[PDB]
Design a protein around this ligand. Structure first.
Ligand SMILES: OC[C@H]1O[C@H](O[C@H]2[C@H](O)[C@@H](O)[C@@H](O)O[C@@H]2CO)[C@H](O)[C@@H](O)[C@@H]1O
Ligand SMILES: O=C(O)c1sc2cc(F)ccc2c1Cl
Ligand SMILES: [Cl-]
Ligand SMILES: [Mg+2]
Length: 514
């Protein structure tokens, strides 16, 4: 393979204590003679699936648990198999965050939740509600200070406020049911936009800018995680850590993250990675080394969390955590976060209204589950000849109308392309499920190679249905679902922005309206 044997390459995010992780890597290297190299690559969450998909990258990947299901679904992660005794050392709910389709896919490291961080010298008694912040800012502005600054370039920091009055990602599961553009999410984001409009916040504010302003004593409040406390210590700001403000009487609900360590599927050092993580990192001395660099929050190791739990900053973290919710690790979390990131930024800058911004994020977040439902039902009914009598569910009218339209249009497309599809199927060799995997690599390169329209999308799906029929014919009907997922994955990954612009399958329905 591409990844070197007899070495350990570890990737972790730049806001985390990588120097302390490196210290742990030095202890491993001292004992074993095996080199350990810690890196903190830019845009790590995107760079890992890119390089791992080619069989390259690090042996160990660090991130919050939410993106690991996507990595697993893409076959980028090795199943981890700790013994019972090691499992019993970590909190059961942390293992839950790294379980995907029955299988553990990472070692949970620490529980991360956003808190309100405030300057005691400027703000002795921090606001219990979001609604008193504008007035609080006015008071402070008279003294040369602002009330609140936090990163507005990542939806992670804004999500507590969005979710406060009833906003949610995926109902808890029902992945089809998405609450990104409901009334509560709209209210939450609207308040945020008004803070900006009324000059209480700046739309351009990011992580560095916010951190800098707070640690320089310029703003009385920031919103951040445990990892940030180190820099505030160095700045000597008299700071406190408390519960996030409420919005409309309801608690802010931070989407809780579990920093986890995964093992590259293509790593030839899986046993080494296992030794490092279990016997060097997930120890009292291991977790402390990292914690002393940048705080981890509430760690998964029971023995060490018992000592840290006494810290009122940790207690506050867990208080915010208990009011929020653990992230899903479903594969389309990446799409969700991207959709919401854009929505928050576009609303903040005025590029979009809150209503339209959230609608798009709603469509983006629905896109994979909506598309799979239609494509899977179409391929299955084309193969067997009989429709699925099961209710569509959430939405519902969109799924049903899109399938009707796909049937009508797809019939003429399959008839006309029958000779072309026969030729394409013979050129490939789809005998079993092992061959379905290869298909996506051929589709993705070809289908993304021109101007997009609904016509080409129907052709793709129709070839899907054609292959589905063939699979049933040769007694490989079990492959129809993986095929539908592969086609769906290709469609939604390569044409995401186009599809959103088209208002998703509503556009497909309208375009072919008879
Ligand atoms: O903003 C979207 C982003 O949210 C979370 O990322 C967090 C991460 O969990 C924290 O440990 C810390 O590094 O802050 C990040 C936000 O900048 C999700 O984990 C991530 O997948 C998502 O893209
Ligand atoms: O991108 C497109 O429009 C086309 S043309 C074509 C021909 C085939 F035999 C199979 C798929 C396909 C696809 Cl997608
Ligand atoms: Cl989960
Ligand atoms: Mg729209």
């Amino acid at each position: 393979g591409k990844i070197e044997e007899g070495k350990l390459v570890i990737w972790i995010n730049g806001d985390k204590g990588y120097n302390g992780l490196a210290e742990v890597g030095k202890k491993f290297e001292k004992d074993t003679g095996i080199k350990v190299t810690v890196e903190h690559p830019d845009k790590l969450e995107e760079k890992f699936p890119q390089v791992a998909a080619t069989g390259d990258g690090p042996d160990i990947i660090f991130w919050a648990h939410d993106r690991f299901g996507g990595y697993a679904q893409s076959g980028l992660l090795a199943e981890i198999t700790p013994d019972k005794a090691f499992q019993d050392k970590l909190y059961p709910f942390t293992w839950d965050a790294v379980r995907y389709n029955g299988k553990l896919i990472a070692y949970p490291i620490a529980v991360e939740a956003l808190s309100l961080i405030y300057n005691k010298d400027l703000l002795p008694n921090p606001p219990k509600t979001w609604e008193e912040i504008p007035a609080l800012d006015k008071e402070l502005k008279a003294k040369g200070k602002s009330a609140l600054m936090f990163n507005l370039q990542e939806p992670y920091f804004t999500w507590p406020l969005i979710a406060a009055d009833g906003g949610y990602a995926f109902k808890y599961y029902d992945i089809k049911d998405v609450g990104v553009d409901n009334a509560g999410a709209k209210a939450g984001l609207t308040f945020l936009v008004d803070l900006i409009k009324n000059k209480h916040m700046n739309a351009d504010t990011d992580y560095s800018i916010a951190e800098a302003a707070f640690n320089k004593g310029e703003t009385a409040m920031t919103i951040n995680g445990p990892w940030a406390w180190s820099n505030i210590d160095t700045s000597k700001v008299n700071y406190g850590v408390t519960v996030l403000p409420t919005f409309k009487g309801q608690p802010s609900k931070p989407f809780v993250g579990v920093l986890s360590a995964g093992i590259n599927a293509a790593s030839p050092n899986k046993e080494l990675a296992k030794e490092f993580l279990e016997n060097y990192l997930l120890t009292d001395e291991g977790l402390e080394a990292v914690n002393k660099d940048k705080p981890l929050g509430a760690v998964a190791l029971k023995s060490y969390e018992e000592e840290l739990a006494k810290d009122p900053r940790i207690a506050a973290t867990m208080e915010n955590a208990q009011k929020g919710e653990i992230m899903p690790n479903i594969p389309q979390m990446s799409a969700f976060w991207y959709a919401v990131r854009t929505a928050v930024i576009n609303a903040a800058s005025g590029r979009q209204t809150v209503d339209e911004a959230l609608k798009d994020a709603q469509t983006g977040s629905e896109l994979y589950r909506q598309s799979l439902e239609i494509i899977s039902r179409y391929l299955r009914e084309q193969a067997t000849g009989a429709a699925d009598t099961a209710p569509m569910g959430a939405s519902g009218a969109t799924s049903r109308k899109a399938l009707e339209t796909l049937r009508r249009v797809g019939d003429g497309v399959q008839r006309n392309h029958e000779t072309a599809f026969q030729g394409m199927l013979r050129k490939l060799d789809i005998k079993n499920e092992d061959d379905v995997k290869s298909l996506s690599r051929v589709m993705i390169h070809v289908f993304s190679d021109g101007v997009t329209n609904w016509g080409r999308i129907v052709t793709l799906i129709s070839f899907g249905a054609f292959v589905a029929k063939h699979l049933k014919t040769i007694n490989q009907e079990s492959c129809i679902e993986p095929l539908a997922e592969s086609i769906t994955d290709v469609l939604v990954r390569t044409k995401r922005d186009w599809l959103v612009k088209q208002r998703g399958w509503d556009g497909f329905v309208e375009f072919f309206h008879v």
